[PDB]
Short mmCIF file of N, CA and C and ligand atoms in Angstrom, two decimals:
data_model
loop_
_atom_site.label_atom_id
_atom_site.label_comp_id
_atom_site.label_asym_id
_atom_site.label_seq_id
_atom_site.Cartn_x
_atom_site.Cartn_y
_atom_site.Cartn_z
N UNK A 1 -7.69 -9.59 22.70
CA UNK A 1 -8.26 -8.81 21.60
C UNK A 1 -7.48 -9.17 20.34
N UNK A 2 -8.16 -9.32 19.20
CA UNK A 2 -7.48 -9.67 17.96
C UNK A 2 -6.49 -8.58 17.56
N UNK A 3 -5.29 -8.99 17.17
CA UNK A 3 -4.30 -8.08 16.63
C UNK A 3 -4.03 -8.42 15.18
N UNK A 4 -3.78 -7.38 14.39
CA UNK A 4 -3.42 -7.51 12.99
C UNK A 4 -2.03 -6.95 12.80
N UNK A 5 -1.13 -7.77 12.26
CA UNK A 5 0.26 -7.36 12.03
C UNK A 5 0.36 -6.81 10.61
N UNK A 6 0.51 -5.49 10.50
CA UNK A 6 0.56 -4.81 9.21
C UNK A 6 1.97 -4.30 8.96
N UNK A 7 2.39 -4.33 7.70
CA UNK A 7 3.73 -3.89 7.31
C UNK A 7 3.59 -2.89 6.18
N UNK A 8 4.24 -1.73 6.31
CA UNK A 8 4.20 -0.67 5.31
C UNK A 8 5.52 -0.68 4.55
N UNK A 9 5.46 -0.92 3.23
CA UNK A 9 6.66 -1.02 2.40
C UNK A 9 6.56 -0.06 1.22
N UNK A 10 7.71 0.22 0.63
CA UNK A 10 7.77 1.12 -0.51
C UNK A 10 9.08 1.87 -0.52
N UNK A 11 9.35 2.52 -1.64
CA UNK A 11 10.61 3.23 -1.81
C UNK A 11 10.76 4.35 -0.79
N UNK A 12 12.01 4.69 -0.50
CA UNK A 12 12.26 5.81 0.39
C UNK A 12 11.60 7.07 -0.14
N UNK A 13 10.96 7.82 0.77
CA UNK A 13 10.41 9.12 0.44
C UNK A 13 8.97 9.12 -0.03
N UNK A 14 8.32 7.96 -0.12
CA UNK A 14 6.95 7.93 -0.62
C UNK A 14 5.91 8.35 0.42
N UNK A 15 6.25 8.37 1.70
CA UNK A 15 5.31 8.73 2.74
C UNK A 15 4.90 7.60 3.69
N UNK A 16 5.68 6.52 3.78
CA UNK A 16 5.36 5.44 4.71
C UNK A 16 5.25 5.96 6.14
N UNK A 17 6.24 6.73 6.59
CA UNK A 17 6.20 7.21 7.96
C UNK A 17 5.08 8.23 8.14
N UNK A 18 4.92 9.14 7.18
CA UNK A 18 3.87 10.13 7.32
C UNK A 18 2.49 9.47 7.38
N UNK A 19 2.27 8.44 6.56
CA UNK A 19 0.99 7.73 6.60
C UNK A 19 0.79 7.06 7.94
N UNK A 20 1.82 6.37 8.44
CA UNK A 20 1.70 5.67 9.71
C UNK A 20 1.43 6.65 10.85
N UNK A 21 2.13 7.78 10.86
CA UNK A 21 1.99 8.72 11.97
C UNK A 21 0.63 9.41 11.94
N UNK A 22 0.09 9.68 10.75
CA UNK A 22 -1.27 10.21 10.66
C UNK A 22 -2.28 9.21 11.22
N UNK A 23 -2.13 7.93 10.89
CA UNK A 23 -3.03 6.92 11.43
C UNK A 23 -2.93 6.86 12.96
N UNK A 24 -1.71 6.82 13.49
CA UNK A 24 -1.52 6.59 14.92
C UNK A 24 -1.81 7.86 15.71
N UNK A 25 -1.26 8.99 15.25
CA UNK A 25 -1.23 10.21 16.04
C UNK A 25 -2.08 11.35 15.48
N UNK A 26 -2.65 11.19 14.29
CA UNK A 26 -3.64 12.14 13.78
C UNK A 26 -3.03 13.51 13.47
N UNK A 27 -1.80 13.52 12.97
CA UNK A 27 -1.18 14.75 12.53
C UNK A 27 -0.11 14.45 11.48
N UNK A 28 0.18 15.45 10.66
CA UNK A 28 1.12 15.31 9.56
C UNK A 28 2.50 15.74 10.03
N UNK A 29 3.50 14.88 9.82
CA UNK A 29 4.90 15.22 10.06
C UNK A 29 5.57 15.42 8.71
N UNK A 30 6.19 16.59 8.51
CA UNK A 30 6.92 16.84 7.28
C UNK A 30 8.34 16.30 7.35
N UNK A 31 8.79 16.05 8.58
CA UNK A 31 10.20 15.69 8.84
C UNK A 31 10.24 14.50 9.77
N UNK A 32 10.62 13.37 9.22
CA UNK A 32 10.80 12.20 10.07
C UNK A 32 11.92 11.38 9.45
N UNK A 33 12.98 11.15 10.22
CA UNK A 33 14.20 10.50 9.76
C UNK A 33 13.91 9.36 8.79
N UNK A 34 14.34 9.46 7.53
CA UNK A 34 14.10 8.37 6.57
C UNK A 34 14.75 7.05 6.95
N UNK A 35 15.68 7.04 7.90
CA UNK A 35 16.39 5.81 8.26
C UNK A 35 15.81 5.09 9.46
N UNK A 36 14.73 5.59 10.05
CA UNK A 36 14.18 5.01 11.27
C UNK A 36 13.11 4.00 10.88
N UNK A 37 13.28 2.76 11.34
CA UNK A 37 12.30 1.69 11.21
C UNK A 37 11.76 1.34 12.60
N UNK A 38 10.45 1.40 12.77
CA UNK A 38 9.87 1.14 14.08
C UNK A 38 8.42 0.69 13.92
N UNK A 39 7.89 0.16 15.01
CA UNK A 39 6.53 -0.37 15.08
C UNK A 39 5.67 0.52 15.97
N UNK A 40 4.40 0.60 15.62
CA UNK A 40 3.40 1.34 16.37
C UNK A 40 2.21 0.42 16.62
N UNK A 41 1.58 0.59 17.77
CA UNK A 41 0.40 -0.18 18.17
C UNK A 41 -0.75 0.80 18.40
N UNK A 42 -1.93 0.48 17.87
CA UNK A 42 -3.08 1.37 18.00
C UNK A 42 -4.33 0.50 18.11
N UNK A 43 -5.11 0.71 19.15
CA UNK A 43 -6.40 0.04 19.29
C UNK A 43 -7.45 0.85 18.54
N UNK A 44 -8.19 0.18 17.67
CA UNK A 44 -9.22 0.82 16.86
C UNK A 44 -10.46 -0.07 16.84
N UNK A 45 -11.52 0.43 16.23
CA UNK A 45 -12.74 -0.33 15.98
C UNK A 45 -12.96 -0.31 14.48
N UNK A 46 -12.99 -1.49 13.87
CA UNK A 46 -13.18 -1.62 12.43
C UNK A 46 -14.38 -2.53 12.24
N UNK A 47 -15.45 -2.00 11.66
CA UNK A 47 -16.64 -2.80 11.39
C UNK A 47 -17.17 -3.43 12.68
N UNK A 48 -17.11 -2.67 13.78
CA UNK A 48 -17.62 -3.11 15.06
C UNK A 48 -16.67 -3.97 15.88
N UNK A 49 -15.55 -4.39 15.32
CA UNK A 49 -14.60 -5.23 16.03
C UNK A 49 -13.54 -4.34 16.67
N UNK A 50 -13.42 -4.42 17.98
CA UNK A 50 -12.31 -3.76 18.66
C UNK A 50 -11.05 -4.60 18.48
N UNK A 51 -10.02 -4.02 17.89
CA UNK A 51 -8.82 -4.78 17.56
C UNK A 51 -7.59 -3.90 17.75
N UNK A 52 -6.43 -4.53 17.73
CA UNK A 52 -5.16 -3.82 17.82
C UNK A 52 -4.45 -3.91 16.49
N UNK A 53 -4.00 -2.78 15.97
CA UNK A 53 -3.11 -2.76 14.82
C UNK A 53 -1.67 -2.67 15.29
N UNK A 54 -0.83 -3.56 14.79
CA UNK A 54 0.60 -3.56 15.10
C UNK A 54 1.29 -3.30 13.77
N UNK A 55 1.76 -2.07 13.58
CA UNK A 55 2.15 -1.58 12.25
C UNK A 55 3.66 -1.39 12.21
N UNK A 56 4.33 -2.03 11.25
CA UNK A 56 5.77 -1.85 11.06
C UNK A 56 5.99 -0.85 9.93
N UNK A 57 6.58 0.30 10.27
CA UNK A 57 6.99 1.33 9.32
C UNK A 57 8.40 0.99 8.87
N UNK A 58 8.54 0.40 7.68
CA UNK A 58 9.85 -0.09 7.26
C UNK A 58 10.71 1.04 6.69
N UNK A 59 12.02 0.81 6.71
CA UNK A 59 12.95 1.80 6.20
C UNK A 59 13.94 1.23 5.19
N UNK A 60 13.74 0.01 4.70
CA UNK A 60 14.57 -0.49 3.62
C UNK A 60 15.59 -1.51 4.04
N UNK A 61 16.86 -1.25 3.76
CA UNK A 61 17.91 -2.22 4.08
C UNK A 61 17.94 -2.50 5.58
N UNK A 62 18.26 -3.74 5.92
CA UNK A 62 18.39 -4.15 7.30
C UNK A 62 19.86 -4.44 7.60
N UNK A 63 20.20 -4.40 8.89
CA UNK A 63 21.53 -4.85 9.30
C UNK A 63 21.85 -6.21 8.71
N UNK A 64 20.93 -7.17 8.83
CA UNK A 64 21.04 -8.48 8.21
C UNK A 64 19.78 -8.80 7.43
N UNK A 65 19.92 -9.48 6.28
CA UNK A 65 18.75 -9.78 5.47
C UNK A 65 17.74 -10.66 6.21
N UNK A 66 18.20 -11.47 7.17
CA UNK A 66 17.27 -12.28 7.95
C UNK A 66 16.23 -11.43 8.66
N UNK A 67 16.59 -10.19 9.02
CA UNK A 67 15.59 -9.33 9.64
C UNK A 67 14.47 -8.95 8.69
N UNK A 68 14.78 -8.74 7.41
CA UNK A 68 13.72 -8.50 6.43
C UNK A 68 12.84 -9.73 6.27
N UNK A 69 13.45 -10.90 6.08
CA UNK A 69 12.66 -12.11 5.90
C UNK A 69 11.76 -12.33 7.10
N UNK A 70 12.26 -12.02 8.30
CA UNK A 70 11.48 -12.25 9.51
C UNK A 70 10.21 -11.41 9.54
N UNK A 71 10.31 -10.13 9.18
CA UNK A 71 9.11 -9.31 9.24
C UNK A 71 8.14 -9.60 8.10
N UNK A 72 8.66 -10.04 6.95
CA UNK A 72 7.79 -10.40 5.83
C UNK A 72 7.07 -11.70 6.11
N UNK A 73 7.74 -12.62 6.80
CA UNK A 73 7.11 -13.89 7.13
C UNK A 73 6.07 -13.71 8.24
N UNK A 74 6.36 -12.86 9.23
CA UNK A 74 5.40 -12.69 10.32
C UNK A 74 4.31 -11.67 10.03
N UNK A 75 4.50 -10.76 9.08
CA UNK A 75 3.45 -9.80 8.76
C UNK A 75 2.28 -10.48 8.09
N UNK A 76 1.07 -10.04 8.44
CA UNK A 76 -0.16 -10.61 7.89
C UNK A 76 -0.66 -9.88 6.65
N UNK A 77 -0.38 -8.60 6.52
CA UNK A 77 -0.78 -7.88 5.32
C UNK A 77 0.17 -6.73 5.08
N UNK A 78 0.23 -6.29 3.83
CA UNK A 78 1.24 -5.32 3.43
C UNK A 78 0.59 -4.17 2.68
N UNK A 79 0.93 -2.96 3.09
CA UNK A 79 0.54 -1.76 2.36
C UNK A 79 1.72 -1.44 1.45
N UNK A 80 1.49 -1.48 0.14
CA UNK A 80 2.55 -1.23 -0.84
C UNK A 80 2.37 0.20 -1.33
N UNK A 81 3.25 1.10 -0.89
CA UNK A 81 3.06 2.53 -1.08
C UNK A 81 4.00 3.03 -2.18
N UNK A 82 3.44 3.80 -3.12
CA UNK A 82 4.23 4.63 -4.02
C UNK A 82 3.73 6.06 -3.92
N UNK A 83 4.47 7.00 -4.50
CA UNK A 83 4.08 8.40 -4.52
C UNK A 83 3.68 8.77 -5.93
N UNK A 84 2.56 9.49 -6.06
CA UNK A 84 2.01 9.76 -7.39
C UNK A 84 2.89 10.66 -8.23
N UNK A 85 3.91 11.29 -7.62
CA UNK A 85 4.83 12.14 -8.36
C UNK A 85 6.21 11.50 -8.52
N UNK A 86 6.33 10.19 -8.28
CA UNK A 86 7.62 9.49 -8.33
C UNK A 86 7.41 8.21 -9.12
N UNK A 87 7.73 8.26 -10.42
CA UNK A 87 7.50 7.10 -11.26
C UNK A 87 8.36 5.93 -10.83
N UNK A 88 9.60 6.19 -10.40
CA UNK A 88 10.44 5.09 -9.94
C UNK A 88 9.79 4.35 -8.78
N UNK A 89 9.17 5.09 -7.85
CA UNK A 89 8.53 4.43 -6.72
C UNK A 89 7.40 3.51 -7.17
N UNK A 90 6.71 3.87 -8.25
CA UNK A 90 5.65 3.02 -8.79
C UNK A 90 6.25 1.78 -9.46
N UNK A 91 7.32 1.96 -10.23
CA UNK A 91 7.97 0.80 -10.84
C UNK A 91 8.51 -0.15 -9.77
N UNK A 92 8.94 0.37 -8.62
CA UNK A 92 9.47 -0.49 -7.57
C UNK A 92 8.41 -1.40 -6.96
N UNK A 93 7.12 -1.09 -7.14
CA UNK A 93 6.08 -1.93 -6.57
C UNK A 93 6.23 -3.37 -7.04
N UNK A 94 6.58 -3.56 -8.32
CA UNK A 94 6.80 -4.91 -8.84
C UNK A 94 7.78 -5.67 -7.96
N UNK A 95 8.83 -4.99 -7.50
CA UNK A 95 9.85 -5.65 -6.69
C UNK A 95 9.31 -6.02 -5.32
N UNK A 96 8.57 -5.12 -4.68
CA UNK A 96 8.01 -5.43 -3.37
C UNK A 96 6.99 -6.57 -3.45
N UNK A 97 6.13 -6.55 -4.47
CA UNK A 97 5.14 -7.61 -4.64
C UNK A 97 5.82 -8.96 -4.76
N UNK A 98 6.81 -9.04 -5.64
CA UNK A 98 7.50 -10.30 -5.90
C UNK A 98 8.27 -10.78 -4.67
N UNK A 99 8.90 -9.85 -3.95
CA UNK A 99 9.73 -10.23 -2.80
C UNK A 99 8.90 -10.76 -1.63
N UNK A 100 7.77 -10.12 -1.32
CA UNK A 100 6.91 -10.61 -0.26
C UNK A 100 6.38 -12.00 -0.60
N UNK A 101 5.91 -12.18 -1.84
CA UNK A 101 5.41 -13.49 -2.24
C UNK A 101 6.49 -14.55 -2.10
N UNK A 102 7.75 -14.19 -2.37
CA UNK A 102 8.83 -15.17 -2.31
C UNK A 102 9.14 -15.59 -0.87
N UNK A 103 9.20 -14.62 0.05
CA UNK A 103 9.52 -14.94 1.45
C UNK A 103 8.41 -15.77 2.07
N UNK A 104 7.17 -15.37 1.82
CA UNK A 104 6.03 -16.11 2.33
C UNK A 104 5.76 -17.39 1.54
N UNK A 105 6.40 -17.56 0.38
CA UNK A 105 6.16 -18.70 -0.49
C UNK A 105 4.66 -18.92 -0.71
N UNK A 106 3.96 -17.85 -1.07
CA UNK A 106 2.53 -17.94 -1.28
C UNK A 106 2.13 -17.03 -2.43
N UNK A 107 1.10 -17.43 -3.17
CA UNK A 107 0.53 -16.56 -4.19
C UNK A 107 -0.61 -15.70 -3.66
N UNK A 108 -1.07 -15.94 -2.44
CA UNK A 108 -2.21 -15.23 -1.85
C UNK A 108 -1.75 -14.54 -0.57
N UNK A 109 -1.33 -13.28 -0.69
CA UNK A 109 -0.87 -12.50 0.45
C UNK A 109 -1.70 -11.22 0.50
N UNK A 110 -2.36 -10.92 1.62
CA UNK A 110 -3.18 -9.70 1.69
C UNK A 110 -2.31 -8.47 1.46
N UNK A 111 -2.73 -7.62 0.53
CA UNK A 111 -1.92 -6.49 0.10
C UNK A 111 -2.90 -5.42 -0.35
N UNK A 112 -2.53 -4.15 -0.17
CA UNK A 112 -3.27 -3.01 -0.73
C UNK A 112 -2.25 -2.10 -1.40
N UNK A 113 -2.58 -1.63 -2.60
CA UNK A 113 -1.74 -0.68 -3.30
C UNK A 113 -2.17 0.74 -2.92
N UNK A 114 -1.21 1.56 -2.52
CA UNK A 114 -1.48 2.91 -2.06
C UNK A 114 -0.69 3.88 -2.90
N UNK A 115 -1.40 4.81 -3.54
CA UNK A 115 -0.76 5.92 -4.21
C UNK A 115 -0.84 7.16 -3.34
N UNK A 116 0.27 7.55 -2.73
CA UNK A 116 0.28 8.62 -1.74
C UNK A 116 0.68 9.95 -2.37
N UNK A 117 0.42 11.04 -1.61
CA UNK A 117 0.73 12.42 -1.98
C UNK A 117 -0.29 12.97 -2.98
N UNK A 118 -1.53 12.48 -2.93
CA UNK A 118 -2.54 12.92 -3.90
C UNK A 118 -2.96 14.37 -3.73
N UNK A 119 -2.50 15.06 -2.69
CA UNK A 119 -2.77 16.49 -2.56
C UNK A 119 -1.89 17.33 -3.46
N UNK A 120 -0.80 16.77 -3.98
CA UNK A 120 0.13 17.57 -4.77
C UNK A 120 -0.38 17.72 -6.19
N UNK A 121 -0.19 18.89 -6.80
CA UNK A 121 -0.57 19.04 -8.21
C UNK A 121 0.33 18.24 -9.12
N UNK A 122 1.61 18.12 -8.77
CA UNK A 122 2.54 17.37 -9.59
C UNK A 122 2.12 15.92 -9.57
N UNK A 123 1.90 15.34 -10.74
CA UNK A 123 1.60 13.93 -10.83
C UNK A 123 2.32 13.39 -12.05
N UNK A 124 3.04 12.29 -11.87
CA UNK A 124 3.65 11.58 -12.98
C UNK A 124 3.02 10.22 -13.23
N UNK A 125 2.26 9.69 -12.27
CA UNK A 125 1.56 8.42 -12.39
C UNK A 125 0.06 8.73 -12.34
N UNK A 126 -0.63 8.55 -13.46
CA UNK A 126 -2.06 8.79 -13.46
C UNK A 126 -2.78 7.66 -12.73
N UNK A 127 -4.01 7.95 -12.29
CA UNK A 127 -4.79 6.95 -11.56
C UNK A 127 -4.99 5.69 -12.39
N UNK A 128 -5.27 5.83 -13.69
CA UNK A 128 -5.56 4.67 -14.52
C UNK A 128 -4.42 3.66 -14.50
N UNK A 129 -3.19 4.15 -14.59
CA UNK A 129 -2.04 3.26 -14.60
C UNK A 129 -1.99 2.41 -13.33
N UNK A 130 -2.27 3.02 -12.18
CA UNK A 130 -2.26 2.28 -10.93
C UNK A 130 -3.47 1.36 -10.80
N UNK A 131 -4.63 1.79 -11.32
CA UNK A 131 -5.80 0.91 -11.33
C UNK A 131 -5.52 -0.35 -12.13
N UNK A 132 -4.84 -0.21 -13.27
CA UNK A 132 -4.51 -1.36 -14.11
C UNK A 132 -3.57 -2.30 -13.38
N UNK A 133 -2.57 -1.76 -12.67
CA UNK A 133 -1.66 -2.62 -11.92
C UNK A 133 -2.41 -3.38 -10.83
N UNK A 134 -3.20 -2.67 -10.04
CA UNK A 134 -3.92 -3.33 -8.95
C UNK A 134 -4.85 -4.40 -9.48
N UNK A 135 -5.50 -4.14 -10.62
CA UNK A 135 -6.35 -5.16 -11.23
C UNK A 135 -5.55 -6.41 -11.57
N UNK A 136 -4.34 -6.24 -12.13
CA UNK A 136 -3.51 -7.40 -12.49
C UNK A 136 -3.10 -8.21 -11.27
N UNK A 137 -3.03 -7.56 -10.11
CA UNK A 137 -2.68 -8.22 -8.87
C UNK A 137 -3.90 -8.74 -8.12
N UNK A 138 -5.10 -8.28 -8.47
CA UNK A 138 -6.28 -8.65 -7.72
C UNK A 138 -6.34 -8.07 -6.33
N UNK A 139 -5.89 -6.82 -6.16
CA UNK A 139 -5.88 -6.17 -4.85
C UNK A 139 -6.51 -4.80 -4.98
N UNK A 140 -6.94 -4.22 -3.86
CA UNK A 140 -7.50 -2.86 -3.89
C UNK A 140 -6.42 -1.82 -4.11
N UNK A 141 -6.84 -0.68 -4.63
CA UNK A 141 -5.98 0.48 -4.84
C UNK A 141 -6.65 1.69 -4.22
N UNK A 142 -5.90 2.44 -3.42
CA UNK A 142 -6.42 3.62 -2.74
C UNK A 142 -5.43 4.76 -2.91
N UNK A 143 -5.92 5.94 -3.33
CA UNK A 143 -5.09 7.13 -3.34
C UNK A 143 -5.22 7.83 -2.00
N UNK A 144 -4.09 8.26 -1.45
CA UNK A 144 -4.07 8.83 -0.12
C UNK A 144 -3.30 10.14 -0.13
N UNK A 145 -3.55 10.94 0.91
CA UNK A 145 -2.67 12.05 1.27
C UNK A 145 -2.43 11.97 2.77
N UNK A 146 -1.18 11.73 3.16
CA UNK A 146 -0.84 11.85 4.57
C UNK A 146 -0.98 13.28 5.07
N UNK A 147 -0.90 14.26 4.17
CA UNK A 147 -0.99 15.66 4.58
C UNK A 147 -2.42 16.05 4.93
N UNK A 148 -3.39 15.70 4.08
CA UNK A 148 -4.77 16.08 4.31
C UNK A 148 -5.57 15.02 5.06
N UNK A 149 -5.04 13.81 5.18
CA UNK A 149 -5.66 12.64 5.79
C UNK A 149 -6.58 11.89 4.83
N UNK A 150 -6.80 12.37 3.61
CA UNK A 150 -7.64 11.67 2.65
C UNK A 150 -7.18 10.24 2.46
N UNK A 151 -8.11 9.29 2.61
CA UNK A 151 -7.84 7.90 2.32
C UNK A 151 -7.04 7.13 3.35
N UNK A 152 -6.56 7.78 4.42
CA UNK A 152 -5.59 7.12 5.30
C UNK A 152 -6.25 5.99 6.09
N UNK A 153 -7.36 6.29 6.77
CA UNK A 153 -8.09 5.23 7.45
C UNK A 153 -8.51 4.14 6.47
N UNK A 154 -9.00 4.54 5.30
CA UNK A 154 -9.45 3.57 4.30
C UNK A 154 -8.33 2.62 3.92
N UNK A 155 -7.12 3.15 3.70
CA UNK A 155 -6.03 2.28 3.28
C UNK A 155 -5.75 1.21 4.34
N UNK A 156 -5.66 1.61 5.61
CA UNK A 156 -5.32 0.66 6.66
C UNK A 156 -6.50 -0.26 6.97
N UNK A 157 -7.72 0.28 7.02
CA UNK A 157 -8.88 -0.56 7.32
C UNK A 157 -9.15 -1.55 6.20
N UNK A 158 -8.93 -1.14 4.95
CA UNK A 158 -9.12 -2.07 3.84
C UNK A 158 -8.13 -3.22 3.93
N UNK A 159 -6.89 -2.93 4.34
CA UNK A 159 -5.92 -4.01 4.49
C UNK A 159 -6.39 -4.99 5.55
N UNK A 160 -6.92 -4.48 6.67
CA UNK A 160 -7.47 -5.38 7.68
C UNK A 160 -8.56 -6.25 7.09
N UNK A 161 -9.44 -5.66 6.28
CA UNK A 161 -10.54 -6.44 5.71
C UNK A 161 -10.00 -7.49 4.74
N UNK A 162 -8.93 -7.17 4.01
CA UNK A 162 -8.28 -8.18 3.16
C UNK A 162 -7.71 -9.32 4.00
N UNK A 163 -7.11 -9.01 5.15
CA UNK A 163 -6.61 -10.06 6.03
C UNK A 163 -7.75 -10.93 6.53
N UNK A 164 -8.88 -10.31 6.90
CA UNK A 164 -10.02 -11.11 7.35
C UNK A 164 -10.50 -12.07 6.27
N UNK A 165 -10.55 -11.62 5.01
CA UNK A 165 -11.01 -12.50 3.94
C UNK A 165 -10.07 -13.68 3.77
N UNK A 166 -8.77 -13.44 3.96
CA UNK A 166 -7.78 -14.50 3.85
C UNK A 166 -7.94 -15.51 4.98
N UNK A 167 -8.26 -15.03 6.19
CA UNK A 167 -8.31 -15.92 7.35
C UNK A 167 -9.54 -16.83 7.33
N UNK A 168 -10.60 -16.41 6.65
CA UNK A 168 -11.85 -17.14 6.73
C UNK A 168 -11.90 -18.34 5.80
N UNK A 169 -10.93 -18.49 4.90
CA UNK A 169 -10.93 -19.62 3.96
C UNK A 169 -10.77 -20.98 4.64
N1 GDP B 201 2.56 16.87 0.17
C1 GDP B 201 2.68 15.66 0.74
N2 GDP B 201 3.88 15.34 1.26
C2 GDP B 201 4.07 14.15 1.85
C3 GDP B 201 2.97 13.19 1.93
N3 GDP B 201 3.44 12.10 2.57
C4 GDP B 201 4.74 12.34 2.86
N4 GDP B 201 5.10 13.57 2.45
C5 GDP B 201 6.41 14.22 2.56
O1 GDP B 201 7.37 13.39 1.87
C6 GDP B 201 8.61 13.31 2.60
C7 GDP B 201 8.95 11.86 2.89
O2 GDP B 201 7.91 11.32 3.67
P1 GDP B 201 8.27 10.12 4.66
O3 GDP B 201 7.06 9.85 5.50
O4 GDP B 201 9.53 10.38 5.42
O5 GDP B 201 8.49 8.91 3.61
P2 GDP B 201 9.15 7.45 3.85
O6 GDP B 201 10.59 7.48 3.44
O7 GDP B 201 8.39 6.53 2.94
O8 GDP B 201 8.97 7.09 5.30
C8 GDP B 201 8.40 14.16 3.85
O9 GDP B 201 9.10 15.39 3.64
C9 GDP B 201 6.92 14.47 3.97
O10 GDP B 201 6.71 15.84 4.28
C10 GDP B 201 1.70 13.60 1.35
O11 GDP B 201 0.73 12.83 1.38
N5 GDP B 201 1.61 14.81 0.78
MG1 MG B 202 10.18 6.60 6.86
#
């Protein structure tokens, strides 16, 4: 069965683990160790194709930098997550975009921009600002809430569809 290797990146505290756990286990966790990096496997059906998602929930620094390069080189698509109430997390997207492109040595890497925590009233990054960034990158942008589940399937399924478009060239 086809497997898609997905990697979730972004600043600490944006909701990478909460998003992953909602996708895999269908519930919201308010408390999940910010230092835990692990992979989850989930069989799903996307556009009629039964496939396996192999998702790496990243946690930032690695014991050795070679471990970061290894997962960036082997990952097929990347969910770049910021939180709509954390401007620093949005500014950090530039760093994640540039770093993945450098490790893969490619200008065409399947990526989706995710603005998480859209259930919160507090917002410091308006939608337009993120739409403009995603346009400059040529990638989709999805607002999500790991708490309410809004957009969660869409974010991950859209990344799979971006990977498919890349593979068919
Ligand atoms: N209200 C709200 N809180 C969230 C959401 N996603 C994550 N959180 C909270 O933000 C904190 C950090 O989330 P976490 O998944 O650990 O982020 P990570 O460091 O990127 O893995 C946790 O306390 C979660 O309760 C969301 O969509 N809405
Ligand atoms: Mg985490």
